[PDB]
Write a protein that binds this ligand. Structure first.
Ligand SMILES: Cc1[nH]c(Cc2[nH]cc(CCC(=O)O)c2CC(=O)O)c(CCC(=O)O)c1CC(=O)O
Length: 312
């Protein structure tokens, strides 16, 4: 029963999947693997029993996975922050010291809404194409003075050098599960679920449960004006959540916390699409409540309206 690992053809995808397989081979020295190169296709490959596990970016996974599927692992989180990559002429500058009316590229409502609010005198225009395509556009064509990208993506590509500015939460908060990898497996597949569990990082898991619960209870998806920020320090788990109108004019930003001691290891159902029976459920549950609490606190202040309008 050799471990078949489904992956997209794109360079970044294949890199991410490799780092996972690499970590599985560290815990299971001899264990044999096999890599097999609009992500529903891979999901269909899980159903056809062609593939055994697929590696996703957490933020690209629905808060509710299709019946039969589950997230078997939340890997250690990389850098969650958003980053700015400047045009060569503006190298050395910050969004804060850019010429007024400078066009910054981004096809992210979350990023756009937040940055129009903190940088009113900068124009935020959408930009399309993979991470490389956008870099061709930023450099060659004369339109964008800068672009916005996830720090974690540049780091995996080895484009760390191109990072011009690491955006703080007080300027732009990250998408839920940004910078963290999720391993998607069949829920009725206890064997794979057992192996893959080594990949669970406790802190990251609790944090991404808070973030996904929160997003889930706002009935939000991948492309909605919703950002978060989580941190664990001395027993406490901190959650900060916010919503914005497409233009970031009206906003709601709140923070709640839960006393959740960060766990050691070990039939209950998954949480926000995540199976993790190998780590204590008390904290997982407790982190979910955090999401729910904050989500309700934002709804109590008309978050739903802001979101319904945001939907074009
Ligand atoms: C949900 C999601 N997925 C991706 C696209 C995506 N998905 C995963 C990564 C890399 C980091 C990661 O894997 O967490 C990226 C690229 C990026 O965020 O710069 C974007 C950004 C699209 C854009 O650039 O306008 C968003 C929206 C958001 O984050 O608010």
């Amino acid at each position: 029963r050799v471990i078949r690992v489904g992956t997209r053809k794109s360079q970044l995808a294949r890199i991410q999947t490799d780092s996972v397989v690499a970590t599985l081979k560290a815990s299971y020295p001899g264990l044999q693997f096999e890599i097999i190169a609009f992500t529903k296709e891979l999901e269909h490959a899980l159903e056809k029993n062609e593939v055994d596990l697929v590696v996703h970016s957490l933020k690209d996974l629905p808060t509710v996975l299709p019946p039969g599927f589950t997230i078997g692992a939340i890997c250690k989180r990389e850098n969650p922050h958003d980053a700015v990559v400047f045009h060569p002429k503006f190298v050395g500058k910050t969004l804060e010291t850019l010429p007024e009316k400078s066009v910054v590229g981004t096809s992210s409502l979350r990023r756009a809404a937040q940055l129009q609010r903190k940088f009113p005198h900068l124009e935020f225009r959408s930009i399309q194409g993979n991470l490389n395509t956008r870099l061709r556009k930023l450099d060659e064509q004369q339109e964008f003075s800068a672009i916005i990208l996830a720090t974690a993506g540049l780091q995996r590509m080895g484009w760390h050098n191109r990072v011009g500015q690491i955006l703080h939460p007080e300027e732009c908060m990250y998408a839920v599960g940004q910078g963290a990898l999720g391993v998607e497996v069949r829920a009725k597949d206890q064997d794979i679920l057992d192996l893959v569990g080594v990949l669970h990082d406790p802190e990251t898991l609790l944090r991404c449960i808070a973030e996904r619960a929160f997003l889930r209870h706002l009935e939000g998806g991948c492309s909605v004006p919703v950002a978060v920020h989580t941190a664990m320090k001395d027993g406490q788990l901190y959650l900060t959540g916010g919503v914005w109108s497409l233009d970031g004019s009206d906003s709601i930003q709140e923070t709640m916390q839960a006393t959740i001691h960060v766990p050691q290891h070990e039939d209950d159902p998954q949480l926000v699409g995540i199976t993790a029976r190998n780590i204590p459920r008390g904290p997982q549950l407790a982190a979910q409540n955090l999401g729910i609490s904050l989500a309700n606190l934002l709804l109590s202040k008309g978050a739903k309206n802001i979101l319904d309008v945001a939907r074009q």
